[PDB]
Design a protein around this ligand. Sequence first.
Ligand SMILES: [Ca+2]
Ligand SMILES: [Ca+2]
Ligand SMILES: [Ca+2]
Ligand SMILES: [Ca+2]
Ligand SMILES: [Cl-]
Ligand SMILES: [Cl-]
Ligand SMILES: [Cl-]
Ligand SMILES: [Cl-]
Ligand SMILES: [Cl-]
Ligand SMILES: [Cl-]
Ligand SMILES: [Cl-]
Ligand SMILES: [Cl-]
Ligand SMILES: [Cl-]
Ligand SMILES: [Cl-]
Ligand SMILES: [Cl-]
Ligand SMILES: [Cl-]
Ligand SMILES: [Mn+2]
Ligand SMILES: [Mn+2]
Ligand SMILES: [Mn+2]
Ligand SMILES: [Mn+2]
Ligand code: NA
Ligand code: NA
Ligand code: NA
Ligand code: NA
Lengths: 237, 237, 237, 237
Amino acid sequence: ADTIVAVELDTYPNTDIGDPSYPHIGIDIKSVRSKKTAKWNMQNGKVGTAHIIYNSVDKRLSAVVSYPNADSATVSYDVDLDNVLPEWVRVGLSASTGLYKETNTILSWSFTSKLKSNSTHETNALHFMFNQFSKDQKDLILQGDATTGTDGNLELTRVSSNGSPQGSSVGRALFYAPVHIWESSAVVASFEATFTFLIKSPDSHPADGIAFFISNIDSSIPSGSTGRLLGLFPDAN
Amino acid sequence: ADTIVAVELDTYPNTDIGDPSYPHIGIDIKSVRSKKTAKWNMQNGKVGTAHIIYNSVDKRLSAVVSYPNADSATVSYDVDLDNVLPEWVRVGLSASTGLYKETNTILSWSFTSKLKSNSTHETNALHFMFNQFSKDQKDLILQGDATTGTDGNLELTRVSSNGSPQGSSVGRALFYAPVHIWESSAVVASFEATFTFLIKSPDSHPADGIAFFISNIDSSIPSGSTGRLLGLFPDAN
Amino acid sequence: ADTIVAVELDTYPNTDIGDPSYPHIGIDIKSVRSKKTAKWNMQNGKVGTAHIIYNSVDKRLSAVVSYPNADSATVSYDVDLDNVLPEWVRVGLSASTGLYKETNTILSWSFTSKLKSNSTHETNALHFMFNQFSKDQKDLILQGDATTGTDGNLELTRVSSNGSPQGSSVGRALFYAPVHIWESSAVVASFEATFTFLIKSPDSHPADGIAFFISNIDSSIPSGSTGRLLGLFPDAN
Amino acid sequence: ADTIVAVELDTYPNTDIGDPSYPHIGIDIKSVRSKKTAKWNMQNGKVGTAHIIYNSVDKRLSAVVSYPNADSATVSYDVDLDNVLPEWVRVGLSASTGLYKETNTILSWSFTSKLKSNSTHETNALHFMFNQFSKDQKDLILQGDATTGTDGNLELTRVSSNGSPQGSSVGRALFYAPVHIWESSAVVASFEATFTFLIKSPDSHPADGIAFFISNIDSSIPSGSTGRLLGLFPDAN
Ligand SMILES: [Ca+2]
Ligand SMILES: [Ca+2]
Ligand SMILES: [Ca+2]
Ligand SMILES: [Ca+2]
Ligand SMILES: [Cl-]
Ligand SMILES: [Cl-]
Ligand SMILES: [Cl-]
Ligand SMILES: [Cl-]
Ligand SMILES: [Cl-]
Ligand SMILES: [Cl-]
Ligand SMILES: [Cl-]
Ligand SMILES: [Cl-]
Ligand SMILES: [Cl-]
Ligand SMILES: [Cl-]
Ligand SMILES: [Cl-]
Ligand SMILES: [Cl-]
Ligand SMILES: [Mn+2]
Ligand SMILES: [Mn+2]
Ligand SMILES: [Mn+2]
Ligand SMILES: [Mn+2]
Ligand code: NA
Ligand code: NA
Ligand code: NA
Ligand code: NA
C-alpha cells in the first residue's frame, strides 16, 4: 500500500472502527484508527481552520482546529516521522462522503517545511500558499473527484451546480513538488500546514471528513476509500 | 521555440552578437542579444551573488550582481512579462561552456513569487530555498550536464572528479512545480530570485555564463546551445 | 518639520491644494500635494486593501488599492528614497477627519523590509503582521486619537461607542522598532506594506483619508493637521 | 527580580551550581541551574549555530547547537511559557566572561514569533533577521559591554582592538520591539530563534557562555551577573 500520515477532521463517528461517539480530530499513522483523538464541536456551514505542526527535535505531530467565536479542539501524538515516511514525500488534502454527505470545500491552504543543516548557510525551505484556486491549477495534482476554480475554491468532493453535496465521492489535491523531510546533515526539520474549510450538509449527520496528509510521492486514491476511509486507506486496519 | 526571459551573468564577450567587449550582466527577452547590459567585474574563483526582482505594477525586470568587498553591477529593463511569458511558467538556472570554459557552480538558490488578488484574503505565494543540493534532488528537473550533490552543490556544467571544468557543456536546473505569474483577479504580481555562484577557470578568458531564467513549463535545452547561447536559445537572433 | 513619504488614500477632494476633483490615491514626497495621483472609486462601508512597494534598484514607489469585485487603482512615482529619508525611519499609518468625516478603521497591517548586503550571508530583514489589534498593543506607538482593541481593530480616528465617526479627529499608529532603509554595504533595499481598511460615513462626502507613511523616528502629529493635512504635514505647501 | 527563560550555551562547568563536568547546552526557567542539559562538544574558534523552538500546543522549549562537520547537541524541556513569562516580553542575547574568558561574538541572529487567532484572518507575526550588525544599530538595545559594528558583528562581551577577549565582562542585545507571546483568541503561539556565534579563547578553559533569552520588557543586567551568572540572574538559586 501507500504510507500515510494524516490529521483527520472526521465528521462521522464510525465506532465499529474505534471512532469516539462524536465528531473528532485525529492523528493517523498508517491507519484510519487514529492513534489519538480529541472531541470536535463541528459547526455545519461555518468556515473553520486547521493547523498542523511538527519538528524532528521533539518528534510530536500536533493539530488544532477552530471556528471564530468558538473554543479550539487540539490533539498531539509522539511519533518520529523519519521512522514512518520516506525521505521524499508529497503533502496533500483528501476528503470523502459515503451514504452520508457534505461539502468538503477548501477556501485556502498553506504549507511551510524547513530542513536546517549543520553548515552555517543553513536552511532548505519550501512554502506555498493558496488563498485562491483557479480552474486549471498546474501546481496541484487533483485525484478522484477533486476540482478547483468553483468560486475560487478547491472542492475535494463532488458538489452539484445547485450548491448541493453528493454522496459516495472521494477526492484529493497534492502539491506538485516533492517535499524533502530528512537530509544527511539535518539538525532540525520542521513543517507546518494551515487550511481553511467549509463543511455543510442538508443532513444532521454529515460525513465523512477532511484530512491533511503526507504520503509517498506516487500516492493515489485507494480502491473503495470513499466514506469512512477518507480517501487515505484501502481498509480499516 | 521555447519562450525565454533570462538575466545573464555572461563571462565571455561575443561582440559579433552584440555583447559589449567585457564580462557583463544582461536582461534577455526572447533573444541572447540582451535588451540591456551593464559592465561586470567578474572575479575568477570568488563566490558571487545575483538578485533578480520584478513586479507587474512597475513592469521592470532588474538585477544586481556582487562579490564581497566589491562594488555591485546593476541592470534594468522596462518590460511587461505578462505580454511575453505564458501565465504558467517554470523558473530555472542554466549555464554553458564552449571552446572556452569554467565551473558553473551554484552554492544556493532561492525564489519567491506572490500573486495578490483583489479579495481581502489576498496572497497566492510560492517560495523555495536551496542552500544544500543533494545527490537525488527530486524537486529539481536537471537537464543536459547539470548534476547535484557534489560538495552539496549544483554543478550546471561538467566538472571532472579532479575539480577541473570541461568545455562544450550545457546544463539546466528547473524547479519541479510550475509558477503562476498571472491571475484573473491579480492586483499585484511580484517575484524575486537570488543565487550564489562560484565561476572558476584555469583560463584568463572563461566562458560562457550563468542565467537565471523563466520559461514555458516543458522548456528543454535547445540543440547546439552550448557556448554563447547559454543553454537558452537555438540561435543568436 | 518632520520628513514624510506617504501613500495617501485621499477621500475628500481639496482642489484648492491640487487634489483632482474625485477621491484618489496619491504619492506624497515631503508635501500633501501629491507628486502623482490616480482616480480612486472609493466604496463607502466596504473593506478595501492597499499595497505599497519599493526598491532601491528601480527607485520607484508604487501603490495599488482595491475592493473585491472591483477594478484596482494604481499610482507610481520615480523617487530615490535614500535622497529623501534618513537611513533610520519609522513606518506607520495616519488618518484624519475635519468638518467632513468617516471611520478610519484598520483591520490588518503588514510590512516587510529587506537590506541585502554584498556579503554572501546577505539579508537584513524586518517583518510584522497585524490581523488582530489588542487593547494594549505594546509594539505600536499610538498618537493623537488612534486607539486599538475595539473589535480587534485599529481606529485611527475617533469613533463613538454607537459606531459613529467623529469630525476634527487625527490619529497615527507607528511600529515601535526603527527600520533601517540604507546600509554601507547594501546592494538592494526593498520594502512592501499592505493594509486593509474600512472607511464608512453617514455622509455622501466623506473625509479626509488614510496614509501609509515613512518618517523620521521621533515623528509626531503636526499641529492643526486634522482634515486635509491627513495628520502628516503642518501646512499645504 | 526579572523573569528569565534562557537557552544557555554554557562553556565553563560550575559543578558547585549543578553544571555537569563539561561544556553543555541548558534550558533555564527562572534559574541558572538548568532544568535540563546535554553535553556540548564546544569547538574553540569555530563558528557555531544555535536553534531554539517552541509552541503552545506541545509546550516544549527545545534547542539544538551545531558546528559544520560535527554532530549536533540537543536539549528539550516540557514547560508552559504562558505560566512563566508575562504576555509581553523582550527577546535577546546575553553573554559573560569572568576570571576565565572568551570572545562572545554574534555573526547573525533571527527570530520569528506567530500568534494564530481563531478568526479566519489568523496570524499575528514578528520576524527579524540580522546578518550584519552596524555601528549604530537603532533596533537593538545594547546593555553592559555589548557593542555592534566591529567587523559587522555583535560583540556581547569586551574585546580589545588587538582581537583579544577581556574577562569580567557582561553584555546583552535585546530587540527594540516587544513581542506578544499570548493573546485572548490565540489557538497556537509559536516562535523560533537562530543565532550564529564565534567563541574563541587563548585559554584551554574558556568562560562563561552565550544565552538566547526571553524576559520582561524592562529587563536589565543584574548586579554581579558576570561570569557563571551569564548576565541573566542576580544569584545561583
Ligand atoms: Ca469516521
Ligand atoms: Ca557571451
Ligand atoms: Ca484631500
Ligand atoms: Ca557555567
Ligand atoms: Cl477529548
Ligand atoms: Cl490533475
Ligand atoms: Cl489500491
Ligand atoms: Cl555600463
Ligand atoms: Cl531529473
Ligand atoms: Cl530544439
Ligand atoms: Cl487617472
Ligand atoms: Cl502609546
Ligand atoms: Cl509641529
Ligand atoms: Cl547528555
Ligand atoms: Cl543602546
Ligand atoms: Cl539588580
Ligand atoms: Mn476517526
Ligand atoms: Mn551577453
Ligand atoms: Mn490628495
Ligand atoms: Mn550551565
Ligand atoms: Na478561495
Ligand atoms: Na551548497
Ligand atoms: Na482585526
Ligand atoms: Na556579521
